[PDB]
Structure 1
Amino acid sequence: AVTLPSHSTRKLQTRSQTWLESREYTKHLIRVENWIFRNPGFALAAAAIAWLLGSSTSQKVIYLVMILLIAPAYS
């Protein structure tokens, strides 16, 4: 398959546990760092661009994250 959409996005809030919450939240973490632990360089570079913005000492702040958050998961 190509694109697989997540039934995650639209779960079903009930008292009984979801299909597999466990192993859910640990994956996004795994990837978004198991990515920077491979193509870490993108860090320092990605960081620069986060500097070339509204450089608010509380804004560059966000941007830095907006970039490293996206790279990892292709979007």
Structure 2
Amino acid sequence: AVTLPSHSTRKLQTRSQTWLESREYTKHLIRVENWIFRNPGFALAAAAIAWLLGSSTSQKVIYLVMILLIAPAYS
């Protein structure tokens, strides 16, 4: 029973304050930070991964974001 649709993906950009934004516009940050605080070495894992893609010294951090941002949620 995955209650899949996090409705924020269907925000109403309307003047009155929405349902639970108060914690929402921090919840994904606390998500990723909690997950990485629990799985630290995955940091240098992602590092060795990204440093091997892009080969730009500028897309490298982009693939770092890639990996560190697939890991938390879809896991």
Higher helix share: 2
Secondary structure of the 1:9 match is helix
Q: What CA deviation, in whole Å up to 9, does each residue of 1:6-64 have, x standing for no partner? A: 21101111110011110001110111010110011111111100011122011112111
**Quick one: percent identity of the two aligned structures?**
100
Output the CA distance in 2 between the equivalents of 1:20 and 1:3: 16
Divergent runs of 4+, >3 A? none
What root-mean-square deviation, in Å, do the aligned CA atoms of Structure 1 and Structure 2 show? 1.3
Q: Which runs of 5+ in 2 are unaligned?
A: none
Q: Which runs of 5+ in 1 are unaligned?
A: none
